[PDB]
Write a protein that binds this ligand. Structure first.
Ligand code: MG
Ligand code: MG
Ligand code: MG
Ligand code: MG
Lengths: 260, 261
């Protein structure tokens, strides 16, 4: 029952990804709009989102689509798509090629289908409930490691955050002291996929929106990973994820400094 | 006479890079030695270093070569090569493909030639004093931006550090508040090249060794960047680098928390 949703997710992610490909390296300061204090958006994000939404609604006209840049369209369906048309906008504008398109479907409150496309590397991560997780048609799974000194952890948190920065610096410092490496690549959907692929053992990302994480959560769960979502799923949330050992370790650190 | 040194630097970087390409994804826990409190090394790092050194000394048998993993070879020379046979070891072992081979030459105390090879992406950054900086034979230059909110800054510092972690957290937080983005990719030589290429406006990396930075400093300077080295150049140093605007900003932040001389 999920296969058609999954193939459409992938096509929609590719459709937005093509916009990203055609414009990579072309976005000048003249084209950047400010959102809030530190966020940027351009015609690239918005055009990608238009294309993704169009694809999804042509196949599933009664579905709801929720995108970062232009909001929601639909009439109240239990099938809700959460779309980040450009995850890694700052990286994209700078020419740092860690950026993605994220297309995730939830049924009620359960994430069931995900596709995350990295256009610069032509790498498509995908997965659906009960069907497994894949990158370009190779099956993927989280790494088995439980040794903290061998673990790698990806992290992110915003500047000008809702929480005091000290909370994130304290969680960071305690995890940093124990693990082999910590990396901050700047695209949360890609971080989830790299845990799912078995590159990083754990991840902690703060102040996420549902389009940041929905597709990656499907892929992570199908890869055997586990996660904890702190806060409101349809609002601003925090994600702690990994294999079982690193999820548990990061969560126990975070609990000293914030309620989870 | 820099052209012959430069072409050899590139060949040596490729020679080590080929060892990295052949073994990427193959290093198991069995193969990993622990160096200090948190550092790893494997047969891959050491084989890459052997190949790089062999190339350099076949062409320049009287030069000095200094590698991270097996130290120095030579008999005293004005010409000293500083080699990181695998910059980004932890990334490499994990399968995160941001890693490089760094091959830099100093004449006395002046860096004069650099090559940094990213084997996964087959991207060779190279430069020499007065000859420019290049990536795969396209000329490169640092970005012009002076707007902090548009700037991107790459950073790194170690998890068992000589300085108290609070110093690095304080410098980080003050730069983070003002700039558009901060990124931690995990390979200092690659960070220097990404500033040289015009991707990131600035960089701050703490507790570096000379093989981490020599090649990248040549490339950065030929790209029009500027840098400040804090500490002993032939010892453990810190680097603050960027275009002029971001170098100055990051340096002014760091001065609040550490002596930058
Ligand atoms: Mg976005
Ligand atoms: Mg996002
Ligand atoms: Mg090294
Ligand atoms: Mg190094």
């Amino acid at each position: 029952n999920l296969k058609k949703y999954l193939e459409v997710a992938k096509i929609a992610a590719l459709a937005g990804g093509q916009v990203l490909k055609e414009n990579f390296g072309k976005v000048k300061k003249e084209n950047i709009e400010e959102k809030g204090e530190k966020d940027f958006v351009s015609y690239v994000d918005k055009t990608s989102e238009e294309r993704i939404k169009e694809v999804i609604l042509k196949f599933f006209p009664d579905h709801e689509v929720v995108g970062e840049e232009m909001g929601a369209e639909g009439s109240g369906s239990e099938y809700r798509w959460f779309i980040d048309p450009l995850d890694g906008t700052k990286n994209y504008i700078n020419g740092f090629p860690i950026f993605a398109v994220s297309v995730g479907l939830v049924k009620g409150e359960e994430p069931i289908v995900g596709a995350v496309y990295l256009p610069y590397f032509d790498k498509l991560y995908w997965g659906a409930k009960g069907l497994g997780a894949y990158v370009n048609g190779k099956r993927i799974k989280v790494k088995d490691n439980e040794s903290l000194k061998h673990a790698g952890v990806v992290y992110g948190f915003p500047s000008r955050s809702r929480r005091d920065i000290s909370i994130y610096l304290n969680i960071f410092k305690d995890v940093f002291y124990e693990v082999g490496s910590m990396r901050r690549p700047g695209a949360a959907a890609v971080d989830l996929c790299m845990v799912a692929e078995g590159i990083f053992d754990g991840m902690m990302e703060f102040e996420m929106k549902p389009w940041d994480i929905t597709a990656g959560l499907v892929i992570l769960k199908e890869a055997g990973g586990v996660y904890t979502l702190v806060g409101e799923p349809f609002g601003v949330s925090d994600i702690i994820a990994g294999n079982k050992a690193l999820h548990d370790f990061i969560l126990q650190v975070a609990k000293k400094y914030m309620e989870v």
